[PDB]
């Protein structure tokens, strides 16, 4: 095997088709399905899999009580076959912790998990299913990372981490790994003012990450990485189609180099594909809660501070719960272009559905089509009343 | 691996032997078995597997209520090891949707699933476990396909689809795929007046499909495809041994080029092997309901409008529930001829057994013998009372 | 891979060591374990596995009621990893039916299952996981076979079948298979008067089978097969150490060429290793019921009508239930000799424990040591009261 | 594959990072998790796995009552994927018995299990998943072994066994195996006065084992083995940092060549890494019970009878239950040095938590870092009240 190189551009996105769906909450009402959150999707050269952070309990188990909580000793990054649910019996543990990323370089997989108390967390970088490198907290305040796949180019896999406040300036670092070893790291540069939970993809030897400015911004920060020079830039999505949550209503003109104000100290992981006229943004439909999900075609969203939608697709109705969303691609597919994909975490239970004592999710995932396909909506599909 | 070519003829069918049986409803009374319907069987060069459309719930799960319904967002094409039941833990998702087909070309597998609302459905064609092509609805009325295996010849895998009314003329198309890409498609030609749910097999470079005329016919339409020329014909089975369900009583003379009347706007998926004197037709025993199943040797059924049985075999007694049936063969077996096989879906629950709130099925499957073997009957075997 | 040849002799048996044990009834009290009976063990070149006839239900499932019955449509030959229990999720179906045998020839595996009603049963011979040959009943009275592994030599795998009465003369045939095809068959010859359920092993190009004379004999019939000439002989074990069950008390002098009388129309599958002074016989400890199990070293048991034990080993105490027993060896092990192995079926439930409505079993298995090892007893270990 | 040679030294241990954790008791509250105890970890060239002795029952099963007991016929050595729990469906049985060790030699795995009654136990040595050698009890008093991995060098895998009293002099033997065959054995020599449950690791062609002196010592005995000469020495850890349990309080000066007194006839399996200044000792925090766990850096612990800690790391708080602990390394990792690892058995249930009727455990495991990482504590995490 050789290292994968990002030699292709994105395919033209004219609509989205269903890729995978696990129905995990429905199925786990009467089967041994692990409680999860913070899911994602990532491909190897011969398989694509679902990933998430387990809570170390099944959803029917009594230990599901309290699973709203973000960072226990009972969490782990798990992976499982595409569109199956994350069960006790089919889930492979990648590493232990409560914040993660993972990516394949074409030869083997790197997985990273962070664990520890808030003031003393540490990352362990696994490569080829073995621990290789460890990184201690630098700011002593919830060292944390992407919660979706990283991207590699000629063996170099950049990863974005943040340590520090969620409600003020923090210390974001871009690490450049190869074979699980640190080649370099850099502090965040550019105009993004706060970074969390980056969702990344690669095309034509560039990695684009769309992140969460938890502190101030309802527009999303964007980091663009050159994995050969091992350098980066940052800015925000200029468009007035705002894509964090909660958020104010859409204005007429956005902000390219500062957070678009109105909502502080909150957010949701999300994503975009930023490719000129071939630009699509994901967002929750609700401005107030993690409800609904839609894709909007917003030509030149990155650079045009008045750009508005020219096409769209509903993924989850506003009467259904959504959650985190992120990017991935099958870098090992056939053909001349990389097909954009994404997933949406469909969160069930607390805090929105507090008649149960747990929080979990299922997954839906879509990839782009060059056709203009009809649209459906893709809810989680479980009935909370069945769990009472 | 090279593409498989249909170089052999059918083996002489002198009886049927048991091939597989999953006992899924019996077992799922106390294990984590998925609710399914629309099953089939399909072989790879090194394994044969069971397939079906999951309902995204176990049979004991509370989400089994409502599984009579045909087309939710919680359905998927799954496959699992031959004669095991479709469990949460052993079922592999092939694609997401509520109508499917799948076949191996000798190199790798093509799977197709259709999803969406009734007026906006779309097919995704997967090849080598990756999405490759997408097809939007052309008639905006429940785009739908075979619900059993497709057949390939030198890489060309024809698939029959229908979009449009179930109770009048519809728009049937034969697509010719290779490596998941569309080489060509054609509209239905010939004398079949309505086509659904084709059951296909190949021999000597010809693919024969026996389908369901839902609108008018109690005889079955037959499509015969030349996968090299990428052309086809259609007609009906001429025989007065009528094989849809519900149906009128058997007459003395059938119809070769039009639907045999008596029953409108209903049917069941079924199959036949049409090979001169070596012709066998499957059918439900009941003329009114999906009850019983039998194979009848009807020499020259395709072409002889007075042909009657010369031999038969009971598969399921008329006091037991049956369901869909379809053809498959192990194109990669040893020997000089292809051994005809079929499966019968044994539907349990609604609507016939409405003391439970679910609908599911198990599978029985048989292949031909050149011996004249004794016959048994093969019921599902579950006791509905245990589920109350 | 080449076909395995029986080139080695037996290792010297000085005691028995534990080889495998599945604890299936204990575990299945609270897990998804299939109801089974008629187990055995058989090796491939790279793995050894447990085998049995499933009943198509879990032990806690409501469909376990009635599993005393021998021959339903819901039975199948399954295999699973050595010493795991036969679960819904780990059991591989080999073929469908209610009487079986299986063996590896060094290249791939042959499995045979018989199904059907009592007057119309048929065997299907699978090779390389595909059906190849079928054999119809010849006597119309419960066609039946070994219920333990067959043995192959240079691709030729003999199998013993019986069709006909269990309580009078029957029609026993030795079939010689190669690649799942029939090379030859012969009717039973020699002095054995009734044959069922042969337990076989091979050494130095000879296959020895120890069987059950259900009709008359409390000594066991022995068939010795030359798999090159494809010929055989039969006789009884001469020893007065009688090894069927139920049986009369041991006499002083046995019978070499006729059934030793006292018990009619009953028996149990069992085994022996017949190798001159290196001869060991298995038997139940009880003369009346399938209780206890012991191995007795009986030099020249086959040929010496006064031979008595010179050594022994208790396997299951007389206060614990036993059941069928049979021979197997790992023909692909390292070293200069074949190590004798056996299993004992530990039957729980009906008819002896009729407070439950099911019948199932677990497995214990042992192989020979050249050491004189200490002995333990190996009960099933489940508590029936837990199942009430 | 070639046999692995111990060519590297230990990496510098500056802290410990999380390696694996199975959360088995939490998960098994509502899934089919086997009852276990005496766990460990061991690597193959391509995978690392968890190991333990099953009790042949699930934790929710009724047969969990009585699982405090050490030595039944229902125990087996099982292995399962790293950080998954030991389930019915994912656990591979290595051999049958109630005392074990296992190690890979670079070509394949040797596993050893001991079974039998107290006065008649026997070891079976498996190699390449087949039984090869058997060893009978020599002292007729609970033949027993390491309960963690063995270590191999150029195919020679030494294993320490003891037979005899737990409360006085016993007969300890070091066996030197190759390909599952006995090359040599030696009686214990040196100054250790009683040996049980050795925890071993290898570096620079030497194997170091830290054991349990059940009879007298609260310091731990150490055996150092030359696997080329097939010779050994023994002594105690000199340090006054005492590491058995129960134990007296730490003194100022320890004992190098005799047991440090204060506690008789009890102990716990434990471990150390003894490498000059790079020396780390594990121990329970409590002096009275199997509570808490910590690692202490004790330069020259082996040889310096006044050595005290210079650094430490808490692994399990003193308010949480611990248990056995042992060493392992991934001898097949990349890089220039072997990374020290260990596990801690987190025992739940009897005797400390006697509101339940079972005894089981989960696993936590850590490996060394050259960084000075922040520390967390890693409890089992189950709530006993949920099991009532
Ligand atoms: C079968 O399936 C197919 C395929 O899926 C279905 O067809 C799809 O149908 C959907 C729904 O209609 C479409 O999605 C919407 O797309 C529009 C964009 O298209 C419109 O606008 C285009 C741009 O027009 C402008 O520029 C052009 C270019 O110069 C100019 O010509 C024009 O005058 C104007 O200045 C038009 O080009 C386009 O027309 C074309 O397509 C038409 C078909 O759609 C066709 O009829 C035409 O002939 C022509 O070819 C079309 O007019 C998105 O704008 C829209 O998204 C908004 O609305 C949804 C709610 O519906 C909302 O959730 C979105 O967030 C968004 O609206 C919010 O954000 C705006 C941006 O800031 C803001 O302005 C809004 O006020 C609104 O904001 C509020 O809500 C948000 C969210 O809660 C909140 O944050 C804010 O604060 C605030 O409260 C949809 O995405 C698909 O594109 C269409 N696909 C295709 C291929 O056709 C078909 O319907 C199905 N069939 C059946 C029978 O069901
Ligand atoms: C052990 O196992 C073996 C192997 O399985 C068992 O043997 C099997 O036994 C079964 C049951 O008997 C047989 O199946 C039936 O086969 C007959 C066909 O064979 C008969 O007809 C042949 C043709 O005769 C005509 O042509 C010849 C050729 O010229 C001519 O000579 C003759 O005069 C006549 O004009 C005969 O050749 C054949 O004889 C041969 O075989 C005999 C053994 O079977 C043997 O004794 C003879 O010596 C000779 O060798 C034989 O007479 C099928 O017709 C039959 O199917 C009909 O009946 C079943 C109900 O039983 C029904 O469900 C079927 O649908 C079908 O009948 C319906 O459809 C007809 C067609 O339209 C219609 O005419 C009927 O009125 C009826 O229609 C009604 O019901 C349907 C369905 O509900 C409904 O849709 C309609 O509207 C309407 O209401 C069976 O398939 C096997 O062939 C036989 N196999 C073998 C190898 O022998 C054996 O019994 C077992 N042993 C034990 C002890 O159990
Ligand atoms: C730790 O583990 C070890 C290893 O497992 C334990 O040692 C084992 O201990 C057991 C139990 O004692 C032994 O099994 C029995 O073996 C005897 C055979 O050995 C005896 O007989 C030999 C033959 O003697 C004759 O020939 C010689 C040769 O010429 C001649 O010298 C002699 O005078 C005589 O004519 C002796 O050679 C042998 O001595 C040797 O070994 C001794 C140790 O065992 C040792 O002390 C000596 O120095 C010497 O070295 C020894 O005397 C079997 O006969 C016996 O099986 C019978 O009894 C059991 C019940 O215990 C029964 O279930 C069996 O079925 C069988 O008895 C039935 O069948 C007979 C045959 O028809 C019949 O005659 C009986 O009446 C009886 O029949 C009744 O019951 C059956 C069944 O229900 C029913 O069907 C009938 O109708 C009827 O009702 C045992 O197998 C192991 O061999 C021994 N192993 C070793 C290596 O030592 C050790 O005990 C353990 N330690 C601890 C502390 O627990
Ligand atoms: C974020 O994470 C990091 C990384 O984990 C956290 O930092 C870690 O913090 C822990 C907790 O503080 C540290 O563990 C302890 O380490 C000490 C050892 O370090 C001290 O001692 C060193 C040696 O000093 C001596 O020699 C030097 C060399 O000459 C000499 O200079 C000195 O004067 C003296 O003579 C010092 O070098 C060292 O200083 C260095 O590090 C300091 C940071 O720790 C730093 O501030 C300094 O500047 C300097 O750089 C330091 O002073 C262990 O001794 C200790 O273990 C004892 O205590 C724990 C309880 O806390 C107990 O459980 C242990 O068993 C042990 O104590 C028992 O055994 C002793 C031995 O017999 C005995 O003497 C005791 O009385 C006691 O015995 C009793 O209990 C036992 C057990 O129940 C029982 O068996 C007995 O019978 C009896 O009842 C801890 O392991 C880490 O080392 C430290 N790691 C790092 C890299 O810094 C950080 O805190 C986290 N941040 C936050 C915000 O939480
Ligand atoms: C796409 C779809 O919903 N197809 C239906 C099919 C259909 O209604 C008739 O053929 C009429 O068009 O009928 C049946 C049926 O049991 O009759 C099941 C199928 N269910 C599923 N494939 N999910
Ligand atoms: C084919 C069949 O039903 N064989 C029977 C067998 C048989 O009844 C006797 O050998 C008499 O012929 O007995 C027994 C038995 O436990 O005695 C079980 C077998 N059960 C099964 N193989 N399923
Ligand atoms: C073979 C055996 O039973 N070994 C025992 C061990 C032993 O009792 C002491 O070391 C004293 O000899 O103690 C313990 C223990 O928890 O202390 C568990 C072990 N349990 C098992 N390995 N099954
Ligand atoms: Ca925000
Ligand atoms: Ca019809
Ligand atoms: Ca369950
Ligand atoms: Ca008998
Ligand atoms: Ca001690």
PDB file of N, CA and C in Angstrom, chain B residues 1 44 46 50 61 75-76 96 144 146 148 162 170 192 210-211 239 241 247 275 283 286 291 321-322 335 377 388:
ATOM      1  N   UNK B   1     -10.007 -12.366 -10.790  1.00  0.00           N
ATOM      2  CA  UNK B   1     -11.381 -12.878 -11.085  1.00  0.00           C
ATOM      3  C   UNK B   1     -11.762 -12.329 -12.469  1.00  0.00           C
ATOM      4  N   UNK B  44     -22.333 -15.386  -4.156  1.00  0.00           N
ATOM      5  CA  UNK B  44     -21.020 -14.881  -4.564  1.00  0.00           C
ATOM      6  C   UNK B  44     -20.186 -16.077  -5.010  1.00  0.00           C
ATOM      7  N   UNK B  46     -17.747 -17.500  -3.605  1.00  0.00           N
ATOM      8  CA  UNK B  46     -17.261 -18.254  -2.453  1.00  0.00           C
ATOM      9  C   UNK B  46     -18.298 -18.434  -1.341  1.00  0.00           C
ATOM     10  N   UNK B  50     -28.495 -15.274   2.465  1.00  0.00           N
ATOM     11  CA  UNK B  50     -29.860 -14.784   2.512  1.00  0.00           C
ATOM     12  C   UNK B  50     -29.887 -13.277   2.492  1.00  0.00           C
ATOM     13  N   UNK B  61     -39.279  -6.387  19.634  1.00  0.00           N
ATOM     14  CA  UNK B  61     -39.182  -4.992  19.987  1.00  0.00           C
ATOM     15  C   UNK B  61     -40.520  -4.297  19.829  1.00  0.00           C
ATOM     16  N   UNK B  75     -36.099   0.959   6.675  1.00  0.00           N
ATOM     17  CA  UNK B  75     -35.805  -0.226   5.900  1.00  0.00           C
ATOM     18  C   UNK B  75     -34.447  -0.188   5.239  1.00  0.00           C
ATOM     19  N   UNK B  76     -33.896  -1.376   5.036  1.00  0.00           N
ATOM     20  CA  UNK B  76     -32.601  -1.519   4.393  1.00  0.00           C
ATOM     21  C   UNK B  76     -32.525  -2.907   3.805  1.00  0.00           C
ATOM     22  N   UNK B  96     -29.651   1.300   1.760  1.00  0.00           N
ATOM     23  CA  UNK B  96     -30.822   1.778   2.460  1.00  0.00           C
ATOM     24  C   UNK B  96     -31.977   1.948   1.495  1.00  0.00           C
ATOM     25  N   UNK B 144     -39.699   1.127  -8.323  1.00  0.00           N
ATOM     26  CA  UNK B 144     -39.617  -0.168  -7.633  1.00  0.00           C
ATOM     27  C   UNK B 144     -38.931  -1.193  -8.555  1.00  0.00           C
ATOM     28  N   UNK B 146     -36.950  -5.575  -8.411  1.00  0.00           N
ATOM     29  CA  UNK B 146     -37.228  -7.026  -8.488  1.00  0.00           C
ATOM     30  C   UNK B 146     -37.628  -7.654  -7.163  1.00  0.00           C
ATOM     31  N   UNK B 148     -35.600  -9.710  -5.812  1.00  0.00           N
ATOM     32  CA  UNK B 148     -34.771 -10.899  -5.833  1.00  0.00           C
ATOM     33  C   UNK B 148     -33.555 -10.633  -6.692  1.00  0.00           C
ATOM     34  N   UNK B 162     -39.932  -0.702 -12.458  1.00  0.00           N
ATOM     35  CA  UNK B 162     -41.188  -0.137 -12.855  1.00  0.00           C
ATOM     36  C   UNK B 162     -41.430   1.128 -12.060  1.00  0.00           C
ATOM     37  N   UNK B 170     -48.048   1.229 -16.594  1.00  0.00           N
ATOM     38  CA  UNK B 170     -46.921   1.814 -15.898  1.00  0.00           C
ATOM     39  C   UNK B 170     -45.735   1.898 -16.855  1.00  0.00           C
ATOM     40  N   UNK B 192     -46.310  -8.237 -22.703  1.00  0.00           N
ATOM     41  CA  UNK B 192     -46.658  -8.080 -21.296  1.00  0.00           C
ATOM     42  C   UNK B 192     -47.261  -6.714 -21.100  1.00  0.00           C
ATOM     43  N   UNK B 210     -39.472 -14.058 -14.729  1.00  0.00           N
ATOM     44  CA  UNK B 210     -40.903 -14.274 -14.540  1.00  0.00           C
ATOM     45  C   UNK B 210     -41.431 -13.263 -13.528  1.00  0.00           C
ATOM     46  N   UNK B 211     -42.437 -12.489 -13.926  1.00  0.00           N
ATOM     47  CA  UNK B 211     -42.787 -11.306 -13.172  1.00  0.00           C
ATOM     48  C   UNK B 211     -44.223 -11.374 -12.678  1.00  0.00           C
ATOM     49  N   UNK B 239     -49.442 -21.307 -20.425  1.00  0.00           N
ATOM     50  CA  UNK B 239     -50.142 -22.424 -19.769  1.00  0.00           C
ATOM     51  C   UNK B 239     -51.396 -21.973 -19.038  1.00  0.00           C
ATOM     52  N   UNK B 241     -52.137 -23.404 -16.297  1.00  0.00           N
ATOM     53  CA  UNK B 241     -51.758 -23.538 -14.895  1.00  0.00           C
ATOM     54  C   UNK B 241     -51.382 -22.135 -14.424  1.00  0.00           C
ATOM     55  N   UNK B 247     -56.078 -15.497  -7.783  1.00  0.00           N
ATOM     56  CA  UNK B 247     -56.268 -15.874  -9.162  1.00  0.00           C
ATOM     57  C   UNK B 247     -57.586 -16.594  -9.291  1.00  0.00           C
ATOM     58  N   UNK B 275     -37.920 -24.180 -19.659  1.00  0.00           N
ATOM     59  CA  UNK B 275     -36.815 -24.863 -20.348  1.00  0.00           C
ATOM     60  C   UNK B 275     -37.411 -26.062 -21.085  1.00  0.00           C
ATOM     61  N   UNK B 283     -46.223 -21.993  -7.462  1.00  0.00           N
ATOM     62  CA  UNK B 283     -47.401 -21.197  -7.141  1.00  0.00           C
ATOM     63  C   UNK B 283     -47.888 -21.463  -5.704  1.00  0.00           C
ATOM     64  N   UNK B 286     -53.421 -22.074  -2.519  1.00  0.00           N
ATOM     65  CA  UNK B 286     -54.677 -21.305  -2.493  1.00  0.00           C
ATOM     66  C   UNK B 286     -54.788 -20.389  -3.687  1.00  0.00           C
ATOM     67  N   UNK B 291     -51.180 -18.759   0.762  1.00  0.00           N
ATOM     68  CA  UNK B 291     -51.267 -19.995   1.534  1.00  0.00           C
ATOM     69  C   UNK B 291     -50.770 -21.139   0.662  1.00  0.00           C
ATOM     70  N   UNK B 321     -48.853 -20.588   5.929  1.00  0.00           N
ATOM     71  CA  UNK B 321     -48.688 -19.341   5.187  1.00  0.00           C
ATOM     72  C   UNK B 321     -47.429 -19.389   4.319  1.00  0.00           C
ATOM     73  N   UNK B 322     -47.564 -18.846   3.104  1.00  0.00           N
ATOM     74  CA  UNK B 322     -46.420 -18.661   2.210  1.00  0.00           C
ATOM     75  C   UNK B 322     -46.244 -17.163   1.959  1.00  0.00           C
ATOM     76  N   UNK B 335     -19.367 -28.594 -11.979  1.00  0.00           N
ATOM     77  CA  UNK B 335     -20.214 -29.433 -12.793  1.00  0.00           C
ATOM     78  C   UNK B 335     -20.597 -28.797 -14.123  1.00  0.00           C
ATOM     79  N   UNK B 377     -43.008 -31.165   3.699  1.00  0.00           N
ATOM     80  CA  UNK B 377     -43.514 -29.800   3.671  1.00  0.00           C
ATOM     81  C   UNK B 377     -42.690 -29.012   4.691  1.00  0.00           C
ATOM     82  N   UNK B 388     -48.123 -13.467  22.106  1.00  0.00           N
ATOM     83  CA  UNK B 388     -49.197 -12.662  22.676  1.00  0.00           C
ATOM     84  C   UNK B 388     -48.928 -12.345  24.135  1.00  0.00           C
TER      85      UNK B 388
END
